[PDB]
């Protein structure tokens, strides 16, 4: 039951946002944003965690046939519109607003609510964003190539980073870059980020402060944050252990409560005085507390990405009932091949400086792709014999 | 090459775009000037090293190779640099500092699979700085993110370069002047090879120096001549190239025969590391037994002759060496597959025909079921020829599934010409023999051993440890992989007290004897003493440091020698198992051999301190007969004994002790001898029956299983004249190695007194392990679940 | 005696061999292991597993 909960956390939103189709209209009612909107929940909610691209396409099957069943009175326009293959209501914040740059860059805040389907914008605001992330950053090293699932990707981990009090297990093959991407996806949302650092000797402290400090991040000071934990920041189960805890609960036993957490929550009481807004008469002492783990709790987001393969994983997530339990799952299939000619050309425009020749250039991309297909085939081969 | 080649042009095939045939790919990428500079420092000459140099050009990443043998290490030991391990406390903090900051090249030479996480944000700022490393032990496991970083290079020696290596190596030792022809017209032929070069610079001289007014310039003339004449050497080169081609070739050919075996020989000696661990060793130690063995014998006279000697001497000196340090249900292993290699070249003998000999009714009517499986198994060339009416005579051949020993007096008639002719008749005998009766299969294995390779490989070794010594230089140690209820420790020592003036110290191993272990040695290096390490099979975390110690670099006083023993326990690194020397000291399997042993233990002072040649030299005649016998019944199983123990000679020396106290003191109050004694042995049966040997046996039927042994061999009486049921001794020392000459090496089990068929299954089941052996080294959640789903609607 | 550390037991081979060695020659004063300073003995000793 807990997924109809995501389902309908998704849908509470736009309060009254979604009224207001007058400046898109784009053929629609109303009721059919809305419907869109059932319809995009209910894939990333549901038509996300599986392995085989078939398994999608009856998810979707199953989605249009239930649709229909109850949209019993406009059946038709869906049919026209939203319940057609062809790509419907991308959803996203940063996008669809400009900052437009008036006076100082940052001249406002996006709206955040929604954005409309369109891939052209969406790729030139990636691509500005881009050339932003490799100045802020030095040595960013990232030549990034966004193609249309990659895009999908991106959007995907906002998804998830964004939301109060959400995480996202991430699943897939190295190289499937998801590490890479969710620095990007990160930046845009303003969440700090630290990984861990495995000394010459491998040991326990290092979590306990790193966790103190993240804490003391989205507790006492209360800013964004994220975590990365991933298999190279795993040298025993213990400190799965206490990640675990960490989703679960959030107390740490005596790591706050070494006659700290006193002193810490006195730091934070002058916000308590507007922010809960007890007559701005007085508060007590143990409510306190309660309130820190609320905030740290509403903003510590946690992204675990591990191998599909191997043979710790399975029964690591055995061991374990909270981690596959509450975070979001998301599968990275291997680039198939309009991905990669699409990688292909856009490395060979700017590189067909000498190698002119119409009706051969779109034959080499797709024999290039038909290479890298094939060196896979190879890799089993050998392996296997 | 192959499976990529075909692989990318049928992709260019299928999509119809136009490519070359052809594909030269070593030619048009890299200038031959380059090859042949390469080729002085110290590049392979053949092909595989070719495109491997071309790969490390490209350097698209910094690489990592594997490497089996040391081609790259080498390599680049002199290909611009002419170094800093990774284990070492300076290197993660220094080296790296100064190779960063100043480009020192930094090579790494210790790759296991486990990184210093240091060492990775390092390699992924100065603008002068390169870094190679590299990994030991083939077959690696690397994570599939160390294969996104730097490439991967194979080096695994093929065998077709290998006969080149070992032939340039040959020719250098048989005589220096062949090397002197060599190179001598080899530098002439590649700076014709040059001559060539310089005409096309000539040629492009004359066609474009000048760019305009080539005509008015008449000298032109004089240029077409000088043209003209730079081809003629090349005609003076392209003679050459006969002169080479046949010369140095017969030269060669008298030679590329031998390392063709070697190569064959090395590939051989690389499975059986993976038959099991500790069986490893380099190609340094193989070539230095090579260069040796053309040293020790190759040279009298008539060259052609000594190639034939070759063909002779260099097999056996490799064969004993790794023999040294094989086990005993591996013996026989090795020399097969020796065979098999040496015949998969020459007499090309099919793979699918070695795996009919590995692996395997309606028309047979008296043979038996467990034979009718063998009938369908030899059944599916003229295998399936031969079953008919031919087979099913049953006129002679009845006799001959009777006989023992089916090979070699009732030779089968079937195929009576194809067996005379033996250039493959042996391998059809055995395909014939293994899939009639696999009961004699062994002994057949023997036999066919002999014959292809000379029974003197089938003929029995035992190691003289004084011999031994001899090769232990100081700067070598010497392992022992032993087995329960063995140890040659009281030999070493023996040994230690005999040539060297002495007593050894020793070190055994555990937990806390690092330092005391390291100030022992260091004792050992300034003095010249012996040490004696133990149970290095557990505490491996010293090892690693061994190697290091033993090093030219700390210098050592002579004969100081090292003694490491150890069991088997994987997971250990083969830093020394890579330069060592491997001994193996199980007891001897042959009822001679361990009686032979045994008269090579407790000898020449023990049997010549008597004051008595009658009596009690009986008495040590007997207890040893009794020891070898009781020792070798356990080879059939649980028909000799409910479980296996490992009596040892600590129990016969405790005899000998007890029975000279005995006869020492009955003999001090005898003033005369009626006949040499006057003993009343009882007690001593009592005592040998079951207090010195009494110690092992936890059954109860043993104890009294062995007091019989003890009545029927003892007697009760010391006869003087009777035959043993098996002889009986004169009275010189000498004499008993000849009685043990004239044993016979396979006895029959009625010398035990038990019944021949014993023989049958104890044979059964060592042929059916060791195919086995060699069947492991070539290169479910289904219907199953579905038939146990109806097995369950089974039970009751 | 056998419920116990494996290297304690490799060890304590190196002792008991020690002592075993020093009792065998009837030598009155010998030299243990690990241990710098010089011991005595008396000869009605015994070990038992
Ligand atoms: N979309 C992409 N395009 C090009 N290269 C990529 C892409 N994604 C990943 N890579 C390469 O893979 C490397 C590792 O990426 P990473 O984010 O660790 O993938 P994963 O998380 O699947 O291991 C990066 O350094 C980058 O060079």
Sequence with gaps: MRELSRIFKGILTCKKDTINDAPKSMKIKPELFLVGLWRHEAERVLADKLVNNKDKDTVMGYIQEVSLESFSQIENEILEKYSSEKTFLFCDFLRPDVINEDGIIEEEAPKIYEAIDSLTELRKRCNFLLSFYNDRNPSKKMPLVLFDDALKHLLRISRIIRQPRSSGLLVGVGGSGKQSLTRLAGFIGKNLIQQIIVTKTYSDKDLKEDIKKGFDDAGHLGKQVTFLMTDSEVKKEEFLEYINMVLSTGEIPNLLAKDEREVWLGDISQAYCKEKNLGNIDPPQSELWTYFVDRVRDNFHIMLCFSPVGQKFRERARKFPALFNECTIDWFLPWPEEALVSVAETFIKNFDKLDTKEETKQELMKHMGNVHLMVNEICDEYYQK | NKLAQQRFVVDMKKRGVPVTPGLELTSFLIDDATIGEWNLQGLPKDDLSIQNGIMVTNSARYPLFIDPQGQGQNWIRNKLSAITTLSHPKFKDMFLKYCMESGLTLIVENIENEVDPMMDPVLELSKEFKLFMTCRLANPSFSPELSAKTTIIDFTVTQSGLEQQLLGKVISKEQKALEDSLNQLLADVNQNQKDLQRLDKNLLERLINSQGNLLDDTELMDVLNNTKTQAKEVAAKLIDAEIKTKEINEKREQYRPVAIRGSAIYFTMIEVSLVNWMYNSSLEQFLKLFIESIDLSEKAQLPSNRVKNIISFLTFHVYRYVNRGLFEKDKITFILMMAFKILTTAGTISSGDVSLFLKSQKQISYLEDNQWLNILALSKPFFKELPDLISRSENQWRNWIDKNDPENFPIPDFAESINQEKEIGSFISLCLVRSLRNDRTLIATQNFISNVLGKEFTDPISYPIEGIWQESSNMDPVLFLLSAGADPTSSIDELAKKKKKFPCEKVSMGEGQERVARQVIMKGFVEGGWVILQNCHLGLKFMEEIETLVSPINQIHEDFRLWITCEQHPKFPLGLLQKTLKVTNEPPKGLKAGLYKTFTTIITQEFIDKVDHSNWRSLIFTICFLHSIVIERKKFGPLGWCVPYEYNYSDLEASLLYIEKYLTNLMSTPQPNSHNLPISMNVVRYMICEVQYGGRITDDLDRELFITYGETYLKDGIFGNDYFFPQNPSAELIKYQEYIAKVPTVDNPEVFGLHSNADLTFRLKESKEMINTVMETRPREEIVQDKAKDMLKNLP | ?49
Excluded: C, G, W
């Design chain 3, 1 to 49: 005696f056998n419920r116990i550390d494996l290297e304690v037991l490799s060890v304590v081979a190196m002792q008991v061999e020690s002592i075993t060695t020093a009792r065998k020659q009837h030598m009155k004063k010998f030299m243990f292991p690990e241990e710098e300073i010089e011991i005595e003995l008396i000869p009605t000793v015994s070990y038992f597993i």
